[PDB]
Design a protein around this nucleic acid. Structure first.
Ligand SMILES: [Mg+2]
Ligand SMILES: [Mg+2]
Ligand SMILES: [Mg+2]
Ligand SMILES: [Mg+2]
Ligand SMILES: [Mg+2]
Ligand SMILES: [Mg+2]
Ligand SMILES: [Mg+2]
Ligand SMILES: [Mg+2]
Ligand SMILES: [Mg+2]
Ligand SMILES: [Mg+2]
Ligand SMILES: [Mg+2]
Ligand SMILES: [Mg+2]
Ligand SMILES: [Mg+2]
Ligand SMILES: [Mg+2]
Ligand SMILES: [Mg+2]
Ligand SMILES: [Mg+2]
Ligand SMILES: [Mg+2]
Ligand SMILES: [Mg+2]
Ligand SMILES: [Mg+2]
Ligand SMILES: [Mg+2]
Ligand SMILES: [Mg+2]
Ligand SMILES: [Mg+2]
Ligand SMILES: [Mg+2]
Ligand SMILES: [Mg+2]
Ligand SMILES: [Mg+2]
Ligand SMILES: [Mg+2]
Ligand SMILES: [Mg+2]
Ligand SMILES: [Mg+2]
Ligand SMILES: [Mg+2]
Ligand SMILES: [Mg+2]
Ligand SMILES: [Mg+2]
Ligand SMILES: [Mg+2]
Ligand SMILES: [Mg+2]
Ligand SMILES: [Mg+2]
Ligand SMILES: [Mg+2]
Ligand SMILES: [Mg+2]
Ligand SMILES: [Mg+2]
Ligand SMILES: [Mg+2]
Ligand SMILES: [Mg+2]
Ligand SMILES: [Mg+2]
Ligand SMILES: [Mg+2]
Ligand SMILES: [Mg+2]
Ligand SMILES: [Mg+2]
Ligand SMILES: [Mg+2]
Ligand SMILES: [Mg+2]
Ligand SMILES: [Mg+2]
Ligand SMILES: [Mg+2]
Ligand SMILES: [Mg+2]
Ligand SMILES: [Mg+2]
Ligand SMILES: [Mg+2]
Ligand SMILES: [Mg+2]
Ligand SMILES: [Mg+2]
Ligand SMILES: [Mg+2]
Ligand SMILES: [Mg+2]
Ligand SMILES: [Mg+2]
Ligand SMILES: [Mg+2]
Ligand SMILES: [Mg+2]
Ligand SMILES: [Mg+2]
Ligand SMILES: [Mg+2]
Ligand SMILES: [Mg+2]
Ligand SMILES: [Mg+2]
Ligand SMILES: [Mg+2]
Ligand SMILES: [Mg+2]
Ligand SMILES: [Mg+2]
Length: 150
RNA sequence: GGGCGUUAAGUUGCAGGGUAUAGACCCGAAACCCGGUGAUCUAGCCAUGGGCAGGUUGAAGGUUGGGUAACACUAACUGGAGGACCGAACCGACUAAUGUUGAAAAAUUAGCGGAUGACUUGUGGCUGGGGGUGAAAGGCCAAUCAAACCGGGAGAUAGCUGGUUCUCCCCGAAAGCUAUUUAGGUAGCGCCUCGUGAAUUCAUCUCCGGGGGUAGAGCACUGUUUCGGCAAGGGGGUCAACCCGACUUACCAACCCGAUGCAAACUGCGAAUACCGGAGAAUGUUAUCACGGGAGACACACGGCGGGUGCUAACGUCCGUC
RNA sequence: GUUUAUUAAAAACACAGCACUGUGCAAACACGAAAGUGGACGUAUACGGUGUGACGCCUGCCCGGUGCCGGAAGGUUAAUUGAUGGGGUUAGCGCAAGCGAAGCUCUUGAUCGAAGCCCCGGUAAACGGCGGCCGUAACUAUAACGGUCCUAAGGUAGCGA
RNA sequence: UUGAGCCUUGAUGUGUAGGAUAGGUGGGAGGCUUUGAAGUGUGGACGCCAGUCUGCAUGGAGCCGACCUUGAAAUACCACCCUUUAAUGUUUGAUGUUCUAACGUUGACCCGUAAUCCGGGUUGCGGACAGUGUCUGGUGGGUAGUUUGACUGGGGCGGUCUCCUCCUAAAGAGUAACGGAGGAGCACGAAGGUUGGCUAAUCCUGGUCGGACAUCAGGAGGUUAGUGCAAUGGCAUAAGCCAGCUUGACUGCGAGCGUGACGGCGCGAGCAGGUGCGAAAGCAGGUCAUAGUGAUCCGGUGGUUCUGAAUGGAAGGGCCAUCGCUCAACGGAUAAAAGGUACUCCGGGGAUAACAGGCUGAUACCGCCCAAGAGUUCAUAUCGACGGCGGUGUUUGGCACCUCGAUGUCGGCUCAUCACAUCCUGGGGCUGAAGUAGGUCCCAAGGGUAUGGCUGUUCGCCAUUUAAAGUGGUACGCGAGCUG
RNA sequence: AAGGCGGCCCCCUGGACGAAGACUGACGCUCAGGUGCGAAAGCGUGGGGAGCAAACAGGAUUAGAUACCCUGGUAGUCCACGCCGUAAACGAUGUCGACUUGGAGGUUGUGCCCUUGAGGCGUGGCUUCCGGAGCUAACGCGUUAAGUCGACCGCCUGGGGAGUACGGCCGCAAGGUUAAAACUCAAAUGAAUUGACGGGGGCCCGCACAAGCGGUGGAGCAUGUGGUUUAAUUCGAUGCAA
RNA sequence: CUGCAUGGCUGUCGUCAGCUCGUGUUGUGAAAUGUUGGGUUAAGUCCCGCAACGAGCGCAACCCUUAUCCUUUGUUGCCAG
RNA sequence: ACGACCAGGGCUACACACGUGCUACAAUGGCGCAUACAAAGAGAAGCGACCUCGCGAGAGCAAGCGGACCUCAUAAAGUGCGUCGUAGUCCGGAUUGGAGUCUGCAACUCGACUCCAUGAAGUCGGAAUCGCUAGUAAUCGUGGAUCAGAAUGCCACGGUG
RNA sequence: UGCCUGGCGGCCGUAGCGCGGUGGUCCCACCUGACCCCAUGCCGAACUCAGAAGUGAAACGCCGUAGCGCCGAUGGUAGUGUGGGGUCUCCCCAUGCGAGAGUAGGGAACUGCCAGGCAU
RNA sequence: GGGGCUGAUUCUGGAUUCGACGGGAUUUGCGAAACCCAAGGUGCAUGCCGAGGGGCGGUUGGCCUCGUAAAAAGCCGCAAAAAAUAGUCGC
């Protein structure tokens, strides 16, 4: 419905623990491009400086140059609007060993863009094997049980 | 009260100017329909008879020999089929030249293609026009074809070009407005001619009543616009070059005053010439108005003046005035 | 080979071959107001129509739209038939306005009523169409790749100033 | 297999109040007993299993009847029969099948008959089908009739077509362009009328959250506010604002005037009737004025002092009100209409375009004036910023001023002529001119001023030479000299 | 012969094995070049097409799935006549002759003995599993040898390049066949062993489950833990096993 | 400070039952047997078979208490008589 | 000076989440009055009987004992009575103001005991989850070490069963 | 006849602002209170009814004052009708009309009716 | 060279991105840095020249100290150079 460019690869590439429905803060010519304008949310992650967890990786194509005064930067760091009450998770459980929180998807909420955030961590190519093995094994167990019980 | 009318005579013939129907001042279309004629040219088809000199190439098939268990396959002899080959009659016209009131309303000379086949030709017949036929070009249908020829409706229509024939005298325009499947036409009005009736009816000059907002002028108003003061600040301060920043730095600078300008869509001002009315002599062949008969015209240009537009360029264009 | 007799003889038409479609005979189709004829004194290896045009490699995706074919579950639906509603008229009731039986007529139209249309599917060798946009690989370039906007599908093989 | 009339009602109910399945009302008090009732068992069904239409092997002799609740007396009576069913003949519609006599036979045999037409007789098959006439729905460029507007600095494309506001518009009115700038196809039962009362926008001071800004009290200001809306002209008596009552947002006229060719449109004192407000004189025929709008014909509604095809009526016609058009191409040609023609045709026009010729020169080319500077110093040996002044008609343009009763247009070959804003030769000045060799300027037209590849060349690129391979005018010279 | 052949019947026909015989007389084996047959898939023409099913569409899974799961579905798989001679066409083991311990079978024929029952002893062909000597690097072969020899043909000489290009032939095509060179590397491999691993299997055990019975997450409080604050919130312990 | 130089110590796997060696034998060899297989158990505990035969650390016992009974010594304890 | 000095704070704090346990949910349960049975332990800067007192903690005086002698130490659950009656309860005992006591020079940070007074939460608790196979689960009390005092923690002991 | 005040007109800046001062005999204005006649989108500030203790402050009316506002000459200038001319996007000549903006200067109104009171 | 449609999550004239990040940093108690001004203490403090300053140097010259003038001590720089990157990903 109101869904926009989403990053479903990061869901398989990470272990999503908790999610944040926090909003995004962006300048002109970009929110219009969210409707149509080729926004891409690849390589998305938070870049906490002090309390400024900007989303760094996103390429939103500028569709016009009619205002040829401001310099266009598709790789701009977008600000994020999150409650200070729930921002404690981000200044907390991020820098342990490898914890990250990445942008899973971006959609519309009554003419305002909301980017879904999620706390996760890497898999080192050995957790992926275990996940695939378990996903296949549950299916195989169900199939063999059904075949045996006819 | 208002409208229409009571007042105040028409009618029948003759001659003349219009109008309406008929052809309607005269010639001219391209086009439509109806009834007949054509296949002797040409297109196709049907039936019946002719024509294709001469010289090349050797497929199928058939024999002999080799070969195969039988085949298959190969060598030699014969073979004469090709919408075959070169090339004559015959058919056609791809190039060049001549010819263009020519020998000829498509031809001549030198070259050219097919020339045993989907060929060509003679004779007779059929296909008849919104139809015929078409190896398909809108090609042919008798030198005429995106609808053949002849006779009729039919003098079709033509807001379109041209022409309109003897004389004299008098008066004398317009090329503008409105509306228009309207712009090069038309109807009314604005103008022209004739007749009738009507009053200082009308015009020139003078005097007297009037309202402008144009030229010009100006910035009370709306915009525009330059400078100085009033004045807050900022901007790589000469200075510390780090500090309160010594604060003054050919930079923008609120509101208001003083000075200087611009304006078709600005007027606190504002003419001349224009326009209407009243009066007065003097002048004009009623020059004025109303009705009736007949028109014409509704393509204007130049020059002066005030302008839009264009480039205050155009013998350019759009308005008013003489 | 043929083609615009009389400015175009060609890449233009035709061609053998290929594909689709219609056609069970009193066949389709065409000329015919009709009879009748051709097709054809043929019989699905026959005939007509439409496209391409010997031969070799092939004819890849789409029914979204317009046609064609199969269906009548539902809605609408002609001609046709006519339940009544509303008036005209007068026998006649009313001292008068005015009610007003039957007959005949003016007008509305309950119900029946097929094809067709909407609809459900197929069919493209039927008419037809088959995308642009951003980032990303060791110097630079490009993008095998990844995301989202639409369509019914984004052009496969092959070829190319 | 199947509907209305019909074979008869087998007929279905329930006021918490209730032997409860209420007798249409009349007569309420029974035919009931051989006008053939309970007892006994219980397919279907009223099942809210109280009752019960109950149906029916055994019966073979009184259930009911008053009424208990009593808002309402029993369905025990008679039945003009409903709060609605029931089946077979039933009234003849559709579907299906059976049959033949209609009809068909481009099946066979015979006959007229010599004969593959035709007709008649026998017969097989199909069969009330097929097929034909009328009406009718759908499809139907296969065919026919047509339509596709106008202005336009040629035509097409674009834009516009009606109405209103300011300028142009030259001080009465009016006045055009594809000139310069904005709006309208409504709205109000109150935003109309009367009466009564009041008069801002804007800038300040102080004051709870309250601030460039809500509200409040005071202060400057005088229409720079407001008008239901675009602009213009006005409004202080207010035409702006608040409240009451109201419907004059009346009916029929209307002397007079203004604007229009006309159709028409607009203002209007005042008259008669009947109303609203205000004590009253007085004000009210809509809105502060200008856009808010469409003629005629045809038909829709109501009323009517009329006409009514012999009479009496009625359909019908007109009369007054009123309704249906983005006829927006808006003075509207039909209720009903798009394109191509290079296969084209006719009447016209240089009233009107493309080539040329003519007028001007925005553009084009060339010259000149001041001089930041470039140029080591030095403006001018050579260039020249920001501008201006010019000359030719030579590039691209403007006009439609001759030519559509005919002026052959690009380029190439032959043939030339003229001008100098001179390519070479000739003469000279200044040079950042040591010499050769260069730059610029001035005078000077006597002469000369290339060959091939590309492409239709003009133009242009390249290769090789020459002292040079100049720019232009002459219908962008020359087709009654030639090709195409 | 190989490829490969499965209801039944009819017709033609190839091949194989046995008791007892008769007969020609080395006529015997192999075989480059050549010839023929030859799984399926594929191609051409003419037919047919029930089911299945490349390509293709849709649905589902997945981060992605142009696939495995599902619904459709054309070529093809079915027939006749034609073309290729391609397979892990394998027994990864060429054709023919002789010899070499044994056991347990299947199929087929014949001889003999009293066949009272597939009673008993023999004797040939094919085929199956163990197994001695021997062989082999070992797996394994083992009278049907991979044991010892005899006759012949074909093939091999490091892994890639490469069974590739060119060249010749064949074929309508897809391609087949014959078959290199340049360049890189010091490796490429096979049989077996020990660990390890498997989304391989089997067995066993422990309050590991089941069975029971009580508890912890709900609520005061206690120390302990992580985070926060703070001057420090004193050090380490950080899954069972803090 | 460095338990990422260590000693010592401790927890878990786990009181789970395996971890090895000598000789011999087998295979050219890496290597295997023993340690595998049936019963049985808490167990590599016991037995049988098998080129295995034995041994070490090992799972048990030897160590500490309870459960019947004997003797000795009798205080601060017992009252059988 | 990262070596070293002592005094005052903080290791005991906090919007939070977590391991573990004690405490309760009330009729087998709390309120009180006879009444019963254990083992093993520690004791001289000590264990510390009596007695006088204190509603209570303990104050004063204080015997004996390196202990089969004395103390800590009338153990309870059990038992027989009464009583309450299903209620935020005579359940549940936390927070609160004040009072003293033990204790160590000093308990605002920061002890424990006491008893008068307010008398919280909580009323068998999701998903999950842990322990036990016999004198063990489960309940009741006692004892021991650390230490001036400051155990729901730790280690042991028996009763029921 | 003089002065003052109140009401209604002529005219709409020489007519009105600013500064200072004036007046309570009469008029004028503030002022007291409210059952009522009347009303507050509340509230006797506005309407109104019943009244003169106080007042001339506010507001009125008056006199001077040139900071204003305003009027406004003569002359000159621009423009313009007529007729004739130039070097013709614009001007000149003869004649007629002659602005606006300035300057000198003026400018603190004029006036009629009705009613009251002062002096007479 | 020209027109015509979109630059509008409403094409619906009234959106607290719910949240971080600037705002009078509007608001309620409050510490001399959210500040701050004649009286009890009675000591050698105010302008006085000062003194060059914490490990080192300097501060608007009176931000430290005094009592007969000085060590300077309350802040900055030399210094405290460790600030330099989500995850997966050669050994
Ligand atoms: Mg012919
Ligand atoms: Mg021969
Ligand atoms: Mg030939
Ligand atoms: Mg020939
Ligand atoms: Mg001949
Ligand atoms: Mg010839
Ligand atoms: Mg010839
Ligand atoms: Mg024709
Ligand atoms: Mg002809
Ligand atoms: Mg003729
Ligand atoms: Mg005729
Ligand atoms: Mg006629
Ligand atoms: Mg004629
Ligand atoms: Mg005509
Ligand atoms: Mg006509
Ligand atoms: Mg006329
Ligand atoms: Mg006169
Ligand atoms: Mg002017
Ligand atoms: Mg005209
Ligand atoms: Mg004319
Ligand atoms: Mg004109
Ligand atoms: Mg003209
Ligand atoms: Mg003129
Ligand atoms: Mg020709
Ligand atoms: Mg030809
Ligand atoms: Mg073709
Ligand atoms: Mg296709
Ligand atoms: Mg379709
Ligand atoms: Mg159909
Ligand atoms: Mg139908
Ligand atoms: Mg037509
Ligand atoms: Mg036109
Ligand atoms: Mg036009
Ligand atoms: Mg005018
Ligand atoms: Mg009023
Ligand atoms: Mg009126
Ligand atoms: Mg108005
Ligand atoms: Mg009509
Ligand atoms: Mg009549
Ligand atoms: Mg009548
Ligand atoms: Mg009537
Ligand atoms: Mg109408
Ligand atoms: Mg009009
Ligand atoms: Mg013509
Ligand atoms: Mg021209
Ligand atoms: Mg000419
Ligand atoms: Mg010029
Ligand atoms: Mg210089
Ligand atoms: Mg001529
Ligand atoms: Mg001519
Ligand atoms: Mg010269
Ligand atoms: Mg020279
Ligand atoms: Mg010179
Ligand atoms: Mg096959
Ligand atoms: Mg499938
Ligand atoms: Mg799929
Ligand atoms: Mg092989
Ligand atoms: Mg052989
Ligand atoms: Mg063997
Ligand atoms: Mg090959
Ligand atoms: Mg065992
Ligand atoms: Mg201690
Ligand atoms: Mg003057
Ligand atoms: Mg003057």
């Amino acid at each position: 419905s109101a869904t926009i460019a989403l990053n479903k690869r990061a869901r398989h590439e990470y272990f999503i623990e908790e999610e944040f429905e926090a909003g995004l803060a962006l300048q002109g010519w970009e929110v219009k491009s969210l409707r149509a304008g080729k926004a891409n949310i690849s390589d998305s992650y938070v870049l906490l400086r002090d309390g400024e967890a900007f989303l760094f990786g996103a390429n939103i194509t500028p569709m016009a140059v009619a205002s040829t005064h401001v310099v266009c930067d598709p790789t701009r760091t977008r600000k994020l609007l999150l409650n200070q009450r729930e921002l404690d998770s981000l200044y907390g459980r991020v820098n342990r060993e490898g914890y990250t929180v990445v942008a899973l998807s971006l959609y519309w909420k009554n003419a305002w863009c909301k980017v879904k955030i999620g706390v996760a961590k890497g898999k080192k190519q050995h957790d992926k094997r275990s996940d695939i093995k378990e996903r296949e094994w549950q299916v195989d167990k169900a199939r063999i049980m059904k075949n045996a019980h006819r």
